[PDB]
Amino acid sequence: ALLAESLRLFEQVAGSLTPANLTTAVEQYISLKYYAGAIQLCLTVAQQKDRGNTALSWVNDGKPANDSRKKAFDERKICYNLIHQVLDKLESDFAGEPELVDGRPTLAATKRMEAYNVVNDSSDEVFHFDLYEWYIEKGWTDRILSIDSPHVITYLQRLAETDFRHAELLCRFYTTRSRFFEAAQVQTNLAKSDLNISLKDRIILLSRAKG
Amino acid sequence: LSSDILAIDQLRELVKQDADNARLSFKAIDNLKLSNADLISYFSKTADEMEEMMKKFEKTITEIEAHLTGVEAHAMAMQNVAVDERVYELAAVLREFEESILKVAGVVGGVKEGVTELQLRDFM
Amino acid sequence: ILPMYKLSP
Amino acid sequence: NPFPGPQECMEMMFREFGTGFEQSNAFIQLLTTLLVPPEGLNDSVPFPEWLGSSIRTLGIEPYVDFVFDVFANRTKDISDPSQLRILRLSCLDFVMVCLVTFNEDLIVLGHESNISIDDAMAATNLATYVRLHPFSRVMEWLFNEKVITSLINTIHQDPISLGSASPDSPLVVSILRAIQVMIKALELQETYLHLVRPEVLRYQGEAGVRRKPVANAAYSAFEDGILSHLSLVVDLGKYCNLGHAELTLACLKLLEKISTSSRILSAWSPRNKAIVQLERNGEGETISASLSASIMATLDPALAASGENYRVKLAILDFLYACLRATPDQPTIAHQLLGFHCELSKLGIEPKGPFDMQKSLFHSLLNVLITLTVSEEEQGMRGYLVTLKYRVLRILQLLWKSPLSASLVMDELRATNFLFHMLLREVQIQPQLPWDGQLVTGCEFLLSDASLAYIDYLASRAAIFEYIGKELCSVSQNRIPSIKRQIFDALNGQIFVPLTIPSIFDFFDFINTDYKWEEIPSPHFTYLKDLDLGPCIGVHYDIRKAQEILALKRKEYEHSQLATPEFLETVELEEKVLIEWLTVRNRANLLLTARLNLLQAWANLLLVMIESNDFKSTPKMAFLLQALQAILPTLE
Amino acid sequence: ALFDSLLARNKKQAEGETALGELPSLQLGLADLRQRLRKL
Amino acid sequence: DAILSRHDLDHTVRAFNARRRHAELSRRCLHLAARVQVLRNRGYALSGDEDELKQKLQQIDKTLNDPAQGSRLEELWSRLIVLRGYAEDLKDQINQAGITESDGLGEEIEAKAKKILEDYDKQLQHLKKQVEEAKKDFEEWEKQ
Amino acid sequence: SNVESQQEELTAWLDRYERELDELYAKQMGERTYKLAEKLTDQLDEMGKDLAKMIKEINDMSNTLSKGSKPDDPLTQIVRVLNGHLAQLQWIDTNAAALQAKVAAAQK
């Protein structure tokens, strides 16, 4: 009742919380294992700093440098970096612990699912992109694949166009889901590309595409 | 005469709105000698009406362009060339109009039946 | 009626 | 300060220079000459941007305003007709020099990408250009009733004067200039009403400008002010019997544009007014007779593309095509010109009329078509003959498909043995016969203009096959073997009047994969390889969509400052190769769709022939085996 | 006198006037008209 | 004949005349209806919905008062006069085929075409009225 | 005659109002925007008129060019009437299509 009412109070002044306070809030939420909630505050503070969604119109146009919309992305990221901060202590506290006693899930495993539902269901896709970019930097490959959101497909598709090693995942994404044609469709269209890819790799691509 | 009917019908509703618009103006003065928020709709209405008349002008203009561009070609062929052959055209036109009418008729019938459907579904 | 339309080469 | 405020002294001087004709014409000519830029007849409007900035004046507008006021009001004080004609010609030349100096594509691209993509720096330049250029004022004046009234009064003259006048007479030149101004106005009215009026209104609302309106709000378009004149079309049609190539082409283009509009035909046919206006004193009959006499005039083999007669013929054909394609269900002036009795939602033929005696425009077209030979020796398979016959066949197809003018046309065609003449005029195609002295296997063939003639010939063959199939189906359903015997004989390769002709299997020579129209040699393209044709693309790849992209890429590379001078020629030659690549792809797509249509028409004809055939099968077994042998490689 | 009235009506049609909208429409015919019909 | 004489002359003129008189009186009506909104409403307190009115007015006025839009007509007129002169010249040149034209046109198929036209007109009128009814009968259902 | 006398009462009265108008002026003696609105509304009428003139002239040139030795002929007649029919047929088609579209709304 205290943490749920604190969350109500924070979301009201979301369009006006200072990064120093928002941090102190998330720091305390983690001490009280209130993972999923703290993530929801940072996501809410993001939207209320930029209601018109300029960080979308900024990234959608693709890296307009020297711009006033840098504020939107930078302020939104202060919250996003805190979401990343929560998700780290989430695994740390429940490190290597199993998601069940026989029959019953742990409450540790519950706070895990509660946390990753806030993340995967959000409608802020600029947050999803910054989240997928950060998952790679941590080597959490199999995490990106499991996500069923359609914001991951746009990220991987837009990155496959100029990065061979990202088009690799999009092909892995489709093949774990058994959309085999869609993978060969990319592997072939990638071997025919204008990208800097060795011939012996293009032999692998076409050999996987043929399969 | 039947064509003359629609003429008066137009002239009827025209003087009637001009009767009211000329009446709405005097009642304002008769009120003064011894509605300002009302004429606003009227002026904005005239505006809204004319706003499309301008679009009509644009349309007709564009058509005129598109037409004279054809006139050029017709003359451009007529200069280049310089009875029985055109008689075939008339037939070719009429036999095609038959088809076009027969095409439209289907649309009309479809609509009418489509309306009677709803009419039926109403009291059914 | 057909003075020249005849197929008389 | 001519030695009293300036706004008053200027108008006093203008009015003083308005009395008479000599000084007025001289001032008009001086202004017209001054409006010409020093580089000759695109930016840097030919006048200083600070013209009249000191005094509170709108710049160069007063001049055009006074010129229009004069031309509209003081045209009645000129008794000498020659002086009035010269003044009208000078005014028309001034208007043309003012209009031709207006940028259309520039303003379009500006309003499209300048503020939305480009920065806001150049926006001020385009704004100043649109605000200072007198095109807006000319367009505003064009919507006045005085101007159009003076124009239609100048164009409305007796025929005896034009007949006895000389080709260099000022009246003909003035009429030509007026028609050209009308064409330009009809073309630019949309661009004006779209990208001039709102900007000018916003500028007048923001800043302080005192201008007097001279346009009629009721006239939403230029057609509203001219739809009230019925004698205009009559005069334009009567002026076709003068022989002047330029004037005839201008009148034909004007009539085509008029028939192409929508408001004019909606006002005329909401009974009708044009059909009764052209049937007052037999104007349609004389117009049709003049058109027939004109199209019958031979052409100059040497001046193929320069023969004014061929140009007039093509203009008339384009006019007829545009008039028949627009609103085919409802009759139009084309049906009346062909020799049909245009009735309300009905047509018909009159006894002893021009179309009944086989002497009309349609019969003249049939004659000039059946008496046309394309097979030449010095060059062989000419191009302009192919274009002429293609236009004629398109007009015939438009007349046939229209059910309102289909039965009578088919009757008149089958009553003269048109299919027989067409078959006799057919010619076989082979990879040896060159097109205009150029061979087909040559790589330049796809880049040359022979592709247009080839597509036209394919479409002509397809239309002929479709007509033959339709006539065969009609004769079969009519259960009359009187004509079936002749049809089969023509298909068997014999004619009983015996004259022999190539069978249908002989014309099956257009399916050839040796040319490899699908395969294309792809150059290396070491650079610009990533530039795709996404925004280019009805298969029609626009060249500007890729031109802008490659220009932006070249600019970025130059800004990178890495061997920009040396590698520029590489990008230039890559662009020169990409443009021809796009043109070749477009031509290949056109040829492929033409071949597809021709094959579909041939298959439909063969199906209609096989199905409706009561003749024995043992004699036709030879043709069956021949068709099987011919299709075997096609299927393989 | 029917067709005559059809002409007369279609004649008065394409000739003005000041009716706040209905301007005279240009007449086509034959060639352009067939295509204009087919484009229906 | 009496009915036609009445219509073709006595009534047409009064119809047209009455229509023009309406237009004129509409202008006068708006002029008065305009001055009413001037003299009485000259209390300086004229605002509120006025902004929207002058906004629309400014928009349409700006759209009209454009160089290009105004220029297009002027260009068109000359562009027409070109074809005028060209056509008149080419016409005077081919002003010989008169008998071919008059006799070529005068025929018999014309009579039949007229008939077919009348038939088309009847069919068209019927269709038009049928659609009209289909509309009028539907706007009823639109309420229920 | 009713429509013709309605343009007599509603004219004499329009003239009658001018007295109360001059009276209002007399009262006030002891705007430009509307005057701009009227001219703005009025200016396009001239454009319509001029456009009509243009269209008429175009018709004249086309008709005279196509045929000019018998303007009283039955060809231009068929042309015109047939154009009328085309236009009317177009109207029918379009409006019918509109009504057809209107039915899809009831198909909820």
Side-chain angles (χ1 to χ4, degrees):
Chain A
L2 267 166
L3 293 170
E5 196 65 11
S6 82
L7 179 52
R8 271 190 71 261
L9 295 156
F10 282 120
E11 288 210 45
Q12 264 186 103
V13 295
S16 59
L17 260 171
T18 69
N21 286 336
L22 174 58
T23 301
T24 318
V26 176
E27 285 174 354
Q28 280 174 294
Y29 282 136
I30 297 165
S31 306
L32 310 173
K33 308 284 199 300
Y34 206 59
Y35 306 109
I39 299 168
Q40 189 186 295
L41 170 54
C42 297
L43 283 157
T44 304
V45 172
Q47 182 62 101
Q48 292 303 320
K49 303 261 182 144
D50 171 30
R51 200 178 321 269
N53 282 351
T54 45
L56 182 68
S57 309
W58 191 82
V59 175
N60 202 100
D61 300 341
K63 184 236 175 184
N66 199 98
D67 206 323
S68 300
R69 285 163 264 151
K70 201 73 203 312
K71 173 191 171 64
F73 191 103
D74 285 16
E75 289 191 328
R76 279 173 175 271
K77 210 226 296 179
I78 302 167
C79 300
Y80 301 161
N81 287 12
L82 291 163
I83 299 172
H84 305 331
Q85 202 168 131
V86 173
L87 293 167
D88 278 20
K89 207 72 170 68
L90 195 185
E91 306 294 351
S92 302
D93 302 346
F94 310 146
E97 214 148 76
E99 276 184 11
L100 68 318
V101 311
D102 172 32
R104 294 190 296 274
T106 62
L107 296 329
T110 305
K111 286 171 183 287
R112 190 207 180 272
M113 210 63 175
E114 285 177 352
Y116 282 108
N117 280 22
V118 178
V119 176
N120 295 347
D121 300 348
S122 179
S123 305
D124 192 334
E125 66 175 38
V126 175
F127 155 78
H128 277 179
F129 298 164
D130 188 273
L131 178 70
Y132 304 148
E133 182 179 284
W134 178 77
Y135 279 153
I136 291 165
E137 164 175 337
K138 265 193 164 287
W140 296 355
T141 299
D142 311 276
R143 175 147 294 172
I144 296 280
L145 302 171
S146 63
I147 292 174
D148 287 276
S149 168
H151 309 292
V152 76
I153 309 178
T154 298
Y155 183 70
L156 300 190
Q157 285 187 283
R158 292 180 184 175
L159 264 282
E161 294 297 339
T162 184
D163 189 331
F164 163 102
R165 293 182 295 102
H166 279 226
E168 187 278 304
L169 284 191
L170 184 65
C171 293
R172 209 136 86 92
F173 179 68
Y174 287 154
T175 52
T176 58
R177 276 165 177 72
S178 310
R179 298 288 294 168
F180 294 136
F181 174 97
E182 275 76 24
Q185 186 67 284
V186 172
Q187 297 174 340
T188 299
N189 286 13
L190 192 58
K192 302 197 301 178
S193 68
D194 281 5
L195 276 56
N196 195 272
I197 309 173
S198 78
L199 183 69
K200 290 175 176 292
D201 281 323
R202 290 172 140 97
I203 282 170
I204 297 168
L205 304 199
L206 293 172
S207 188
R208 296 178 187 175
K210 181 171 177 168
Chain B
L1 291 175
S2 183
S3 181
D4 209 335
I5 301 301
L6 282 295
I8 275 68
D9 287 24
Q10 200 177 29
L11 264 166
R12 279 181 67 82
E13 294 189 3
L14 280 168
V15 177
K16 285 290 292 186
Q17 69 172 2
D18 277 31
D20 288 18
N21 295 337
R23 176 171 295 97
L24 290 164
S25 67
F26 167 71
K27 295 301 182 184
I29 301 173
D30 184 31
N31 165 266
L32 170 143
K33 185 172 180 178
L34 304 176
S35 60
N36 282 317
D38 188 31
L39 306 176
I40 302 172
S41 61
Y42 163 83
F43 274 77
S44 69
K45 269 173 182 182
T46 55
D48 290 330
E49 282 187 340
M50 188 140 289
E51 186 178 2
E52 300 181 359
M53 189 185 294
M54 190 169 292
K55 301 172 185 172
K56 302 197 192 194
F57 291 142
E58 181 179 5
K59 288 172 185 181
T60 50
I61 287 162
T62 50
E63 291 174 26
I64 293 156
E65 297 175 8
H67 187 213
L68 293 172
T69 46
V71 179
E72 290 178 6
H74 177 61
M76 181 177 293
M78 183 169 287
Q79 77 86 18
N80 183 22
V81 173
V83 177
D84 208 328
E85 288 67 16
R86 56 174 179 177
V87 169
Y88 156 83
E89 194 82 310
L90 184 61
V93 167
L94 297 174
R95 74 172 183 74
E96 217 165 43
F97 273 146
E98 179 178 338
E99 184 179 352
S100 71
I101 293 171
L102 290 169
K103 160 174 170 57
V104 173
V107 183
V108 178
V111 172
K112 197 180 71 171
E113 188 177 358
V115 176
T116 58
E117 169 55 29
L118 311 183
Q119 288 190 304
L120 179 64
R121 198 166 76 89
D122 200 79
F123 307 102
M124 180 174 292
Chain C
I1 305 177
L2 288 67
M4 59 179 64
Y5 302 92
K6 303 299 297 185
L7 300 175
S8 180
Chain D
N1 182 90
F3 302 90
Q7 73 294 355
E8 299 180 0
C9 290
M10 63 187 299
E11 58 177 0
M12 287 173 62
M13 295 295 291
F14 274 110
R15 181 172 59 268
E16 184 64 12
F17 298 154
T19 59
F21 159 76
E22 286 68 5
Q23 62 182 9
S24 300
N25 181 21
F27 205 163
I28 292 169
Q29 293 293 354
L30 180 61
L31 295 174
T32 303
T33 303
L34 292 174
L35 290 176
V36 184
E39 295 76 7
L41 202 173
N42 179 21
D43 203 357
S44 181
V45 71
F47 66 86
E49 287 69 4
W50 61 89
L51 179 61
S53 60
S54 300
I55 59 176
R56 185 178 183 275
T57 306
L58 289 67
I60 199 171
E61 298 295 351
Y63 300 91
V64 180
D65 302 332
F66 172 81
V67 170
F68 271 90
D69 185 5
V70 170
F71 178 83
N73 297 332
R74 308 187 67 176
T75 53
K76 285 68 172 180
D77 300 330
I78 304 301
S79 60
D80 191 331
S82 180
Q83 299 180 1
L84 182 60
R85 290 189 178 89
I86 293 169
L87 181 61
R88 292 175 173 178
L89 174 56
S90 300
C91 290
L92 293 171
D93 299 330
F94 179 84
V95 171
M96 286 192 64
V97 171
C98 295
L99 293 173
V100 174
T101 321
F102 180 85
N103 306 125
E104 183 178 0
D105 300 330
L106 200 171
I107 300 298
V108 169
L109 272 61
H111 184 61
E112 183 178 0
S113 300
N114 181 271
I115 187 62
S116 61
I117 303 175
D118 203 336
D119 60 358
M121 300 298 181
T124 59
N125 300 20
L126 282 64
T128 301
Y129 177 86
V130 173
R131 290 183 300 92
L132 301 179
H133 197 269
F135 174 81
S136 61
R137 189 65 175 179
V138 175
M139 293 298 297
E140 184 179 0
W141 274 96
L142 286 174
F143 291 99
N144 190 330
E145 61 181 0
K146 302 297 184 299
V147 179
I148 64 96
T149 49
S150 300
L151 290 172
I152 63 98
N153 292 18
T154 305
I155 298 170
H156 180 60
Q157 301 296 351
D158 56 354
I160 187 64
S161 300
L162 285 66
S164 61
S166 182
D168 300 0
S169 178
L171 178 57
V172 180
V173 182
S174 61
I175 294 169
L176 206 176
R177 295 289 180 275
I179 295 169
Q180 288 175 335
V181 170
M182 290 179 179
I183 291 169
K184 293 174 64 58
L186 293 174
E187 289 182 0
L188 303 178
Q189 60 184 0
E190 300 180 0
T191 303
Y192 169 83
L193 297 175
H194 294 359
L195 280 63
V196 179
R197 182 173 60 181
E199 182 64 12
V200 174
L201 291 172
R202 187 181 66 179
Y203 179 82
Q204 183 178 0
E206 293 178 0
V209 182
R210 181 180 299 180
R211 184 178 299 180
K212 182 175 66 176
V214 298
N216 300 90
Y219 301 157
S220 180
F222 187 87
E223 289 70 1
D224 196 331
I226 56 174
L227 52 68
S228 300
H229 301 275
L230 303 177
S231 60
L232 180 61
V233 63
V234 180
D235 300 0
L236 292 171
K238 289 181 177 179
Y239 298 157
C240 293
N241 194 20
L242 302 177
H244 299 168
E246 300 180 0
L247 181 61
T248 48
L249 268 64
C251 291
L252 291 172
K253 182 62 177 180
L254 181 59
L255 295 175
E256 182 178 0
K257 292 182 67 175
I258 291 168
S259 60
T260 304
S261 179
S262 300
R263 299 182 180 181
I264 187 64
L265 57 77
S266 300
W268 291 0
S269 60
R271 179 62 176 84
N272 191 275
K273 300 183 293 183
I275 64 182
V276 61
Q277 180 57 217
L278 275 61
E279 295 178 359
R280 295 292 184 179
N281 301 329
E283 288 70 359
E285 300 180 0
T286 179
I287 290 167
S288 302
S290 61
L291 294 172
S292 300
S294 180
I295 62 181
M296 288 179 179
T298 183
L299 56 78
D300 182 70
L303 299 176
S306 299
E308 73 293 352
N309 300 91
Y310 191 81
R311 300 180 61 180
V312 173
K313 292 172 186 182
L314 265 54
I316 296 165
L317 292 173
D318 299 0
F319 169 82
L320 295 174
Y321 182 92
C323 185
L324 295 173
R325 183 178 180 84
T327 310
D329 56 358
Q330 199 66 221
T332 174
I333 306 302
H335 297 178
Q336 178 178 348
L337 295 174
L338 290 172
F340 298 91
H341 180 270
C342 298
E343 192 61 15
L344 181 60
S345 62
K346 184 184 295 184
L347 277 60
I349 303 173
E350 59 180 0
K352 301 182 272 65
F355 186 87
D356 187 6
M357 302 300 297
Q358 300 182 178
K359 300 294 182 299
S360 180
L361 181 60
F362 191 83
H363 296 83
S364 301
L365 292 173
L366 294 177
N367 291 121
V368 65
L369 180 63
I370 62 182
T371 193
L372 189 161
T373 302
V374 183
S375 180
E376 298 295 350
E377 300 295 349
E378 72 296 348
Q379 289 293 354
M381 300 297 180
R382 304 302 303 274
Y384 65 108
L385 281 70
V386 171
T387 303
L388 187 70
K389 63 184 294 184
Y390 175 82
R391 297 289 179 82
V392 172
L393 291 174
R394 284 207 302 179
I395 295 172
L396 291 174
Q397 288 185 136
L398 290 178
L399 294 173
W400 299 346
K401 291 183 174 60
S402 61
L404 183 59
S405 303
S407 300
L408 302 177
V409 178
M410 292 295 180
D411 298 330
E412 295 293 351
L413 289 173
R414 68 183 181 179
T416 182
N417 299 120
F418 179 78
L419 72 169
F420 290 87
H421 296 83
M422 293 300 297
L423 293 174
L424 293 174
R425 295 283 74 84
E426 288 292 357
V427 182
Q428 183 178 2
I429 56 177
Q430 298 181 0
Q432 300 295 351
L433 283 63
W435 293 80
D436 301 0
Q438 183 177 131
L439 189 57
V440 303
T441 190
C443 60
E444 71 289 354
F445 179 85
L446 304 177
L447 300 176
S448 301
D449 61 72
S451 300
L452 302 177
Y454 198 85
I455 296 165
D456 295 330
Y457 193 81
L458 294 173
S460 300
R461 277 191 171 183
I464 293 169
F465 301 154
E466 183 178 0
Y467 173 82
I468 292 169
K470 292 173 64 58
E471 184 173 354
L472 176 56
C473 180
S474 300
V475 173
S476 66
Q477 65 178 221
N478 294 330
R479 57 172 297 180
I480 54 114
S482 60
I483 306 175
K484 298 179 68 176
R485 300 296 183 276
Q486 299 186 144
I487 293 169
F488 281 111
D489 298 331
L491 296 172
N492 294 120
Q494 299 77 3
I495 305 177
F496 302 154
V497 182
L499 181 60
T500 59
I501 53 175
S503 180
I504 187 175
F505 302 151
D506 195 332
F507 300 94
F508 190 78
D509 296 357
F510 58 89
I511 300 299
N512 298 271
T513 59
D514 300 330
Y515 303 154
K516 302 185 296 302
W517 294 354
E518 291 71 358
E519 189 278 344
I520 187 77
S522 300
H524 57 278
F525 276 95
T526 182
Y527 195 73
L528 304 181
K529 60 177 67 176
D530 59 357
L531 203 176
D532 59 356
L533 306 179
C536 300
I537 183 62
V539 181
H540 51 65
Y541 303 154
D542 185 5
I543 301 174
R544 191 69 176 86
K545 303 298 182 181
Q547 193 282 341
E548 61 183 0
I549 296 170
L550 58 87
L552 181 61
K553 194 173 185 181
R554 183 189 295 92
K555 293 292 183 299
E556 292 293 353
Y557 184 87
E558 183 178 0
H559 297 175
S560 181
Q561 299 295 352
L562 294 172
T564 76
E566 300 180 0
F567 292 87
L568 178 58
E569 286 68 5
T570 62
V571 184
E572 291 178 0
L573 57 86
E574 285 182 3
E575 181 181 0
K576 290 194 295 297
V577 172
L578 185 149
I579 59 100
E580 58 177 1
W581 173 276
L582 264 56
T583 59
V584 169
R585 272 189 168 275
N586 294 282
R587 294 292 182 84
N589 180 89
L590 293 173
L591 270 64
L592 288 172
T593 181
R595 174 175 291 183
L596 189 288
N597 295 281
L598 180 58
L599 195 165
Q600 182 177 359
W602 179 86
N604 298 18
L605 176 60
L606 180 57
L607 291 173
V608 172
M609 186 185 301
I610 295 170
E611 185 177 3
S612 61
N613 178 20
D614 59 356
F615 190 79
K616 298 185 294 301
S617 180
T618 64
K620 196 176 180 180
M621 184 60 63
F623 293 173
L624 265 64
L625 268 59
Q626 290 293 354
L628 291 173
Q629 293 283 23
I631 63 183
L632 176 59
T634 307
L635 275 296
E636 290 179 359
Chain E
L2 172 54
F3 174 84
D4 305 22
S5 73
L6 294 175
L7 169 74
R9 188 181 178 280
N10 195 264
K11 177 264 181 182
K12 294 179 289 189
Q13 176 183 315
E15 189 250 317
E17 302 276 358
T18 309
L20 310 182
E22 50 181 12
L23 308 180
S25 57
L26 50 88
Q27 65 181 241
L28 296 87
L30 306 177
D32 298 329
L33 198 60
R34 284 174 77 188
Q35 295 187 3
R36 279 288 302 277
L37 182 274
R38 279 288 84 181
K39 281 183 291 187
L40 177 57
Chain F
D1 277 334
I3 297 166
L4 295 164
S5 87
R6 271 183 155 281
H7 162 84
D8 211 42
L9 295 174
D10 187 83
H11 291 192
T12 309
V13 64
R14 280 200 294 183
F16 166 66
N17 192 28
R19 292 149 74 184
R20 225 209 303 98
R21 288 291 83 88
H22 153 274
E24 183 180 346
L25 292 172
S26 182
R27 182 150 176 73
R28 285 208 173 190
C29 171
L30 194 144
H31 191 44
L32 208 167
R35 283 187 181 183
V36 165
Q37 209 74 347
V38 172
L39 305 182
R40 177 179 63 176
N41 212 267
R42 209 183 64 81
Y44 300 148
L46 204 168
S47 185
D49 303 331
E50 182 75 346
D51 178 36
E52 305 166 16
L53 190 147
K54 298 296 160 199
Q55 272 174 5
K56 290 181 179 181
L57 183 145
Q58 277 178 1
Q59 285 176 2
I60 187 167
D61 182 33
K62 279 179 184 177
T63 307
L64 174 56
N65 297 16
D66 190 86
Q69 298 294 344
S71 178
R72 279 214 292 178
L73 304 173
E74 301 177 2
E75 291 175 342
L76 215 162
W77 274 100
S78 59
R79 184 181 188 281
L80 175 62
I81 295 167
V82 170
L83 284 164
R84 183 189 306 281
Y86 189 85
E88 289 289 357
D89 188 275
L90 179 59
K91 183 183 182 57
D92 296 344
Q93 184 177 352
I94 316 295
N95 202 318
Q96 197 172 340
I99 302 172
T100 304
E101 178 174 308
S102 61
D103 205 333
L105 170 54
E107 205 75 355
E108 192 277 300
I109 303 109
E110 304 280 339
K112 296 167 69 177
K114 286 181 188 185
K115 183 69 170 61
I116 298 295
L117 246 58
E118 292 174 349
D119 288 19
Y120 281 177
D121 179 80
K122 293 180 180 181
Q123 297 174 0
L124 265 284
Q125 291 288 357
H126 177 266
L127 288 166
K128 176 174 177 295
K129 298 299 178 184
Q130 199 173 184
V131 174
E132 278 285 11
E133 290 294 345
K135 184 184 294 185
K136 189 191 302 305
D137 197 25
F138 182 94
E139 60 178 5
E140 182 185 15
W141 158 264
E142 282 280 34
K143 305 302 182 183
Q144 311 171 13
Chain G
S1 296
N2 294 269
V3 179
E4 190 167 25
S5 61
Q6 274 189 25
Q7 294 193 326
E8 190 183 4
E9 300 178 1
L10 304 170
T11 64
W13 283 13
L14 188 144
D15 282 20
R16 204 72 56 205
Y17 309 154
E18 300 176 356
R19 276 54 181 172
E20 301 182 349
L21 177 140
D22 298 332
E23 185 180 338
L24 177 48
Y25 270 106
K27 285 185 178 182
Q28 178 174 315
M29 278 296 297
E31 181 280 338
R32 189 82 78 178
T33 58
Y34 290 99
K35 190 163 183 175
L36 216 169
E38 291 198 54
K39 266 59 178 181
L40 177 62
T41 301
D42 172 87
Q43 186 171 69
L44 290 176
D45 193 40
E46 183 63 22
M47 177 173 294
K49 197 169 289 182
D50 184 83
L51 190 70
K53 180 184 292 183
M54 179 185 295
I55 300 156
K56 287 175 181 178
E57 288 186 5
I58 298 164
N59 279 24
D60 292 331
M61 280 310 312
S62 55
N63 279 114
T64 52
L65 173 59
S66 303
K67 195 192 181 80
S69 71
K70 216 159 79 73
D72 200 42
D73 75 320
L75 190 62
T76 193
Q77 261 158 37
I78 288 182
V79 171
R80 285 172 187 183
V81 176
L82 193 145
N83 295 131
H85 293 179
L86 182 275
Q88 191 172 191
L89 196 143
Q90 285 176 335
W91 184 98
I92 293 167
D93 176 87
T94 50
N95 284 90
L99 275 182
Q100 186 58 31
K102 283 275 189 62
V103 171
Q107 299 304 324
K108 296 169 185 176

